[PDB]
Amino acid sequence: LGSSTNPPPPETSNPNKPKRQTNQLQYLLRVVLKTLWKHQFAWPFQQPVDAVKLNLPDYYKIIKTPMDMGTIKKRLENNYYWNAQECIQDFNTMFTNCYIYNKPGDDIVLMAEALEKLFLQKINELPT
Amino acid sequence: NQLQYLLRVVLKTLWKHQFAWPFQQPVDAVKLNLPDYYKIIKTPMDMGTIKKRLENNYYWNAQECIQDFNTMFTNCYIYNKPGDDIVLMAEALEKLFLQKINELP
Amino acid sequence: WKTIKGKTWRTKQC
Numbered sequence: 001l002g003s004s005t006n007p008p009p010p011e012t013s014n015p016n017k018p019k020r021q022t023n024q025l026q027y028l029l030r031v032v033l034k035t036l037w038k039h040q041f042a043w044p045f046q047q048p049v050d051a052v053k054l055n056l057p058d059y060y061k062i063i064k065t066p067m068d069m070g071t072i073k074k075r076l077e078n079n080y081y082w083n084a085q086e087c088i089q090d091f092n093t094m095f096t097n098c099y100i101y102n103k104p105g106d107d108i109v110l111m112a113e114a115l116e117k118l119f120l121q122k123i124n125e126l127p128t
Numbered sequence: 129n130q131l132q133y134l135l136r137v138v139l140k141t142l143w144k145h146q147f148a149w150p151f152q153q154p155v156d157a158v159k160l161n162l163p164d165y166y167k168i169i170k171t172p173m174d175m176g177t178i179k180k181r182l183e184n185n186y187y188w189n190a191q192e193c194i195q196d197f198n199t200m201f202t203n204c205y206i207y208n209k210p211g212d213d214i215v216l217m218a219e220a221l222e223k224l225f226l227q228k229i230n231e232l233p
Numbered sequence: 234w235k236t237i238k239g240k241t242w243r244t245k246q247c
Contacts, residue, residue, distance in 0.1 A: 044245075054245060055243075056243060056245065058242035058243060059242075061242070062146070062242060063146070064146035065146065096216045096220070099211070099213055099216060100147070100213045100216055100217060100237075101235070101242075101244065101245075102235065102244040102245055102246065103235050103244055103246065106244055106245065106246040107245075107246060108244075108245045108246070149238065149240060150237065150238035159239070160238060160239060213235075213237060214237060214238065217237075
């Protein structure tokens with residue numbers, strides 16, 4: 001027996017992955033992520049899922065590619081992405097993970113759906 | 129050559145995916161309590177059946193095997209509504225599938 | 234609790 005543990009967080013930099021900072025990626029950090037980060041429902045998503053504190057031994061048994069806004073935040077500040085599509089995929093992974101692991105109607109799903117609808121509003125104005 | 133790649137690489141990669149478990153065997157609609165499943169899904173398909181077909185010289189060519197893969201994905205998108213958890217799992221599996229077959233020899 | 238295709242786990246709701 002023992003205490004269940006959290007896996008290491010996802011990487012926020014990589015010397016082998018090409019770096020870039022386009023105006024869309026700037027917009028994703030200073031507008032899109034900025035709006036979601038300050039939302040009232042943002043707190044469960046600003047850091048990797050803490051399965052230990054949440055007493056969720058099955059979470060990382062189900063989710064093998066976790067994602068959070070704190071990882072996304074560091075990736076944007078580090079110019080981790082080459083384009084906006086790569087960053088948008090990290091957002092969708094975060095949402096999809098929450099929708100697969102939790103039931104429709106759950107509080108965490110209601111909060112994730114609210115953040116996603118706001119996310120879709122901002123990326124609809126992604127600049128040229 | 130291409131049928132070897134689908135059995136040795138493509139299926140092996142998808143079978144080890146985190147969201148592969150609902151698609152590794154035929155849908156037992158009775159055990160899973162899905163009474164309308166086979167009324168709606170006329171041609172069920174799964175990676176376990178594709179494995180048996182790839183091992184037993186079933187497919188005429190690699191394109192027939194790819195059709196069975198797409199049928200498996202299409203079935204999920206037909207039976208479950210968009211945004212369902214199982215649908216999202218199928219889309220993740222499908223995206224990896226399209227990436228692995230895009231490098232077909 | 235959530236069940237997907239013969240597999241069950243605890244959600245954040247529980």
